[PDB]
Design a protein around this ligand. Sequence first.
Ligand SMILES: C[C@@H]1CCCN1CCOc1ccc([C@@H]2c3ccc(O)cc3CC[C@@H]2c2ccccc2)cc1
Ligand SMILES: C[C@@H]1CCCN1CCOc1ccc([C@@H]2c3ccc(O)cc3CC[C@@H]2c2ccccc2)cc1
Lengths: 238, 233
Amino acid sequence: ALSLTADQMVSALLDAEPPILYSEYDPTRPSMMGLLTNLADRELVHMINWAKRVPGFVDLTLHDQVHLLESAWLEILMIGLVWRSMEHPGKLLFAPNLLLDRNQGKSVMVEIFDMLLATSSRFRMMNLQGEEFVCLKSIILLNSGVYTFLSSTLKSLEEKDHIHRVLDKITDTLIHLMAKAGLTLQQQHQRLAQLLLILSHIRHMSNKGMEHLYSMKSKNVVPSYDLLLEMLDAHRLH
Amino acid sequence: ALSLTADQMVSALLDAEPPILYSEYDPTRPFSMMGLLTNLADRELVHMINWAKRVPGFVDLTLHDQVHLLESAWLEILMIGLVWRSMEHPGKLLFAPNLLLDRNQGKSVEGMVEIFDMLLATSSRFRMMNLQGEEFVCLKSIILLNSGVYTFTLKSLEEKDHIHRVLDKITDTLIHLMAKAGLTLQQQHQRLAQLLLILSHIRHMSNKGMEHLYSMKSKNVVPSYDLLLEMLD
Ligand SMILES: C[C@@H]1CCCN1CCOc1ccc([C@@H]2c3ccc(O)cc3CC[C@@H]2c2ccccc2)cc1
Ligand SMILES: C[C@@H]1CCCN1CCOc1ccc([C@@H]2c3ccc(O)cc3CC[C@@H]2c2ccccc2)cc1
């Protein structure tokens, strides 16, 4: 678990990658938020499966797993989107059959389209690599909720220590990747820093986004603890 | 500014540090929490502008871009300051030397104890990491340069490039500090990452806080571009 080598970490993360889903609409017919919501809902099921395959995540309590996903899920959809969109300047590839520019975001939203587009830009600028992307996405999963375990039972302390050890392992892994690519030591820590500072912006976008979903006043429109629990709380019967 | 050594960067940042202000209230009268905190934050902001102008590379930017960066960062910068001076007061927030509050005192306005709890947890994280003063001023400068840089023409391309060069320099500086402290190369990279990942939480806290002040519907409870412009210009 914490015994994995760097290439073992990378391979594990790459293997765990969720699928790219399609928007569900009649391509033979002439709804924006509805399309985006349906897509996100289906992605979330796959995100749970992905999380359970991030090395060290299942070692956590069921409760702490839920807490981490409750905190990170929109950031994770967003970094997924920004990655998919990297090779489509000016557009967001929500799905292979749903490629939108900023003008199409005006039907509701263009404020958060603009933020997403700029992140995609920034990724393009840095020439972000696939192996770097999956590290970052796992870092979001582990880090986003780790400061909000309002708890300090012995168990909670052990949980927080474990999470920071897994995070250290991914740091080592990112550095390894950049060493593997020929970067100098200075280039390595500079790029590590550049990559991690983008995570703050992704946090920001998730907050502006959560702000919309909460403004809708829809009873299901933000995944409840209980929904996330139902989805993570698997049996071993299959 | 891009020609500073790591030690010169650290000296510059340490010298740039704003003063610790006091809360303004009559200490002889019986103990408005929001009013006290707002008055304190208002006065800190003026000193923040002076500090920002002293961060190496900041005044090299256009005045427009200076304003944009402060507009994005100002609440994060107040928050990291608070968390830092609270570090050695477990369970409390040292808003000012004469205003040390625990979470119970945060319950006076609705929606405030949640923000208190987050601030306290960050302070705890700082305590656990044994955060050093030199690291703190690096981090605060990083917030200033980074928070607005993804939400901005050839001039703008040049501005963004400059900002990222200054950020790289502060990264170099943090690593140099950890080197001086004798950490291994592995430990250096791990601690760099741990420090930077806390900045995501501080952003989160700023967003929750901005949400409070916007909810107040007070005419100028969020500092305007033009007020920031006036103080910077
Ligand atoms: C999907 C969630 C899970 C349970 C309830 N359901 C609420 C729907 O929340 C969303 C999440 C993301 C989006 C949009 C989106 C969809 C898929 C994806 O891969 C990325 C994103 C990025 C955010 C985007 C969005 C979010 C808020 C407001 C406008 C657009 C829209 C609605
Ligand atoms: C600060 C700005 C300047 C122009 C308008 N004015 C609005 C008042 O804004 C604030 C900012 C921070 C606070 C609280 C604060 C005070 C001093 C400081 O050094 C640290 C902080 C941390 C945030 C805190 C707060 C913020 C929002 C809601 C509750 C508590 C309160 C009001």
